[PDB]
């Protein structure tokens, strides 16, 4: 059986770690909910 | 059981020990997560039970106790925060500028951040603290890097 446990408040935090790039990608979404890259 | 607003871990005892299979958001008495995390199964909250209410495999979303309540959207310009809840680790805010998933049915924001599978369902937030979507359904690109869609449902 699956169960839930509280992990935190949902808030924006000033001076959080800033990382990650911003790619623009052509994708397709299938009937199963799987995304795939189109080229 | 626990109905307080906030971010929650989704755990199971089916495998070795206690395993975190995903994350979700409690808001206005409704628990929101990704479909692939629970597969539509019921959840426990202490001594209480959460039954699924709405779900869709294609959107990869599911709500418990009521209809989907999260209606904020990424503005297409500003940076956001992934409120990551990794297995066995503390909740951590990570600020990033989303990229774009371009599809035949329209454009969706995407976050290029890589966390273990059990982090699926962690919320993505705007500057007001509003949940603009959930992390955990995406793709792997050319350099082996994971990019997740900012997946949001519709509030009726
Ligand atoms: C620790 N972390 C968020 C990652 O695995 N990243 C590094 C920078 N952006 C891409 C993936
Ligand atoms: C859905 N999800 C977050 C995953 O399965 N990932 C991303 C790529 N690295 C392993 C874990």
UniProtKB/Swiss-Prot annotation, chain B:
Residues 1-156 form the Peptidase S7 domain. It is a peripheral membrane protein. Acetylated by host KAT5. Acetylation modulates NS3 RNA-binding and unwinding activities and plays an important positive role for viral replication. It is found in: Host cytoplasm; Host endoplasmic reticulum membrane. The active site is at residues 36, 60, 120. It comes from the Viruses. Forms a heterodimer with NS2B. Interacts with NS4B. Interacts with unphosphorylated RNA-directed RNA polymerase NS5; this interaction stimulates RNA-directed RNA polymerase NS5 guanylyltransferase activity. Interacts with non-structural protein 2A. Interacts with host SHFL; this interaction promotes NS3 degradation via a lysosome-dependent pathway. Interacts with host CEP63; this interaction disorganizes the centrosome and inhibits host innate immune response. This is Serine protease NS3. The lineage of its organism: Viruses, Riboviria, Orthornavirae, Kitrinoviricota, Flasuviricetes. The chain holds residues 1514 to 1669 of 3419 of the full protein.
